[PDB]
């Protein structure tokens, strides 16, 4: 089922 | 144990895509334009149920930080810095993203036919180009939407509105010179 798109916020990264 | 795919086929659209191909996603906001992006990479959990492709995002131009313009076409998009990872299942299908003379010389432009003329970035909202030719009393960039006439006095393009001039009246001419000739 089409899941929603869910966008980062510009110019940040993922700590993992 | 992820492995990078060839293709992968989207079931409730009920299509496959491949990295490079341009797809449309759901938005968080359903009362809003489906996101356009372009596929980099698509992963999978080893031979497993979940997969993830990760996207280059193209900002539509209400969608960026200067805001939609009078210059921005209707089914213009910016290509950007900006990448990150969503699921496949977002993907509500495909579409094209055309370069801007390619995108004029379509014959008809489908709901999913955009174009691009600008490259975009995400965290300061510069673009490249800087700058770009202008027409018109206007002085502004073409806008591929609207329809425009040619003065070959002055061998550049007028908008209608812009002097004294119906749309219909412009597109009988063969003959037409602006008033600076
Ligand atoms: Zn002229
Ligand atoms: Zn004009």
Redesign the pocket.
């Given at each position: 089922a089409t899941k929603a798109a869910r966008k980062s916020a510009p110019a940040t990264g993922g700590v993992k | 144990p992820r492995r990078t795919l060839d293709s992968y086929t989207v079931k409730p659209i009920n299509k496959t895509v491949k990295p490079g191909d341009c797809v449309l996603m759901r938005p968080s906001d359903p009362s809003k334009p489906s996101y356009v992006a372009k596929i980099e990479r698509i992963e999978s959990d080893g031979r497993g149920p979940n997969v993830r492709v990760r996207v280059r995002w193209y900002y539509r131009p209400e969608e960026s930080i200067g805001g939609r313009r009078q210059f921005h076409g209707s089914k213009e998009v910016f290509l950007s810095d900006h990448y990150d990872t969503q699921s496949a299942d977002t993907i509500e299908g495909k579409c094209m993203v055309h370069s801007f003379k390619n995108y004029t010389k379509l014959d008809a432009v489908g709901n999913d036919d955009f174009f691009c003329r600008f490259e975009y970035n995400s965290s300061t909202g510069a673009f490249n180009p800087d700058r770009v030719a202008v027409?018109?009393?206007?002085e502004?960039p073409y806008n591929p939407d609207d329809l425009m006439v040619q003065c070959e006095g002055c061998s550049d393009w007028?908008?209608p509105?812009?002097?004294e001039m119906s749309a219909e009246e412009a597109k009988r001419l063969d003959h037409f010179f602006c008033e600076n000739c």
């Amino acid at each position: 089922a089409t899941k929603a798109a869910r966008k980062s916020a510009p110019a940040t990264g993922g700590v993992k | 144990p992820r492995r990078t795919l060839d293709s992968y086929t989207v079931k409730p659209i009920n299509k496959t895509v491949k990295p490079g191909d341009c797809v449309l996603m759901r938005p968080s906001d359903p009362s809003k334009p489906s996101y356009v992006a372009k596929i980099e990479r698509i992963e999978s959990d080893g031979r497993g149920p979940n997969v993830r492709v990760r996207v280059r995002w193209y900002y539509r131009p209400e969608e960026s930080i200067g805001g939609r313009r009078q210059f921005h076409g209707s089914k213009e998009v910016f290509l950007s810095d900006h990448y990150d990872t969503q699921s496949a299942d977002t993907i509500e299908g495909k579409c094209m993203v055309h370069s801007f003379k390619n995108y004029t010389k379509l014959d008809a432009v489908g709901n999913d036919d955009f174009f691009c003329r600008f490259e975009y970035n995400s965290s300061t909202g510069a673009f490249n180009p800087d700058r770009v030719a202008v027409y018109c009393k206007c002085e502004m960039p073409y806008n591929p939407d609207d329809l425009m006439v040619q003065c070959e006095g002055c061998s550049d393009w007028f908008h209608p509105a812009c002097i004294e001039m119906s749309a219909e009246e412009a597109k009988r001419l063969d003959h037409f010179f602006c008033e600076n000739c």
